[PDB]
Amino acid sequence: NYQPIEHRGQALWLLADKAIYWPARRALLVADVHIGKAASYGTTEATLARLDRLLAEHDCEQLIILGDFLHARTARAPATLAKVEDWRKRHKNLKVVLIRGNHDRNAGDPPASLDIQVVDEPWVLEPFALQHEPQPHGTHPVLAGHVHPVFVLRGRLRLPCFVIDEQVSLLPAFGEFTGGWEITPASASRLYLAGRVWPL
């Protein structure tokens, strides 16, 4: 279930499971998936199956990963890439665009058999500069990943949050990890807690 917002003249749906759906572009946006950052006690399969649920829920002609799809060199692993191959060939017609992050650079471009269009930040889909790193763009509003934004609630709970802002907006990390960059409670931006999508 989703929270619609207007942002720079576009209707964007913030998804409870840490994704943005862009209806006019029939596009699903996520960031910091970190396939291969799984521990052994959160799984690669669970992450891919989590994508399959969003892709079945919404008309997605394309998926755009704002950086950090595969974790590292131990994510170019025999078993692990096999599961991604499995997943990709179940969505043969989906276009998958990866904007390269510091982990995509480190590991290297995903193998060509997986049919992933690798591009360099910024990748501009008007009105938006899509980026991994949240650097301001010279002319466009930015949608970015990289920082793994969370918001701290006390009674502490680190919840993943969207940061919707005029110049640089942040998507929450799609991977399921501890930590995250604590977003200041005094920010002059719109915050949505991606457990519903909870505004502030």
- Which tokens in the block code for residue 149? 């934004």
Determine contact, residues 75/111, Cβ cutoff 8 Å. Answer: no
Part in contact with Mn ion (CB under 5 A); list of ranges 15-23, 37-45, 77-85, 102-110: 102-110
Write down the number of H helices and E strands in the chain.
3, 16
Rank residues 32 and 165 by Cβ distance to Mn ion and give the closer one.
32
Minimum CB separation from Mn ion for residue 148, in Å?
6
Minimum CB separation from Mn ion for residue 11, in Å?
27
The stretches of 72-182 forming alpha helices (DSSP H) are 78-89, 102-107
Minimum CB separation from Mn ion for residue 98, in Å?
13
Rank residues 73 and 90 by Cβ distance to Mn ion and give the closer one.
73
> Is 146 annotated as a binding-site member?
yes
Q: Does 102 bind Mn ion (CB under 5 A)?
A: yes
Question: What part of residues 123-152 is at the interface with Mn ion (CB under 5 A)?
Answer: 146
Rank residues 61 and 109 by Cβ distance to Mn ion and give the closer one.
109
Question: What is the rounded distance in angstroms from the CA atom of residue 32 to the CA atom of residue 176?
Answer: 10
Rank residues 36 and 101 by Cβ distance to Mn ion and give the closer one.
101
Residue 102 per-residue DSSP state: H
Part in contact with Mn ion (CB under 5 A); list of ranges 40-48, 64-72, 104-112, 182-190: 64-72
Determine contact, residues 69/35, Cβ cutoff 8 Å. Answer: yes
Torsion sign across C-alpha atoms 179, 16, 14, 96: positive
The stretches of 1-58 forming alpha helices (DSSP H) are 44-57
Binding region for Mn ion (CB under 5 A): 32, 68, 101-102, 146
Residue numbers belonging to the annotated binding site for Mn(2+): 32, 34, 68, 102, 132, 146, 148
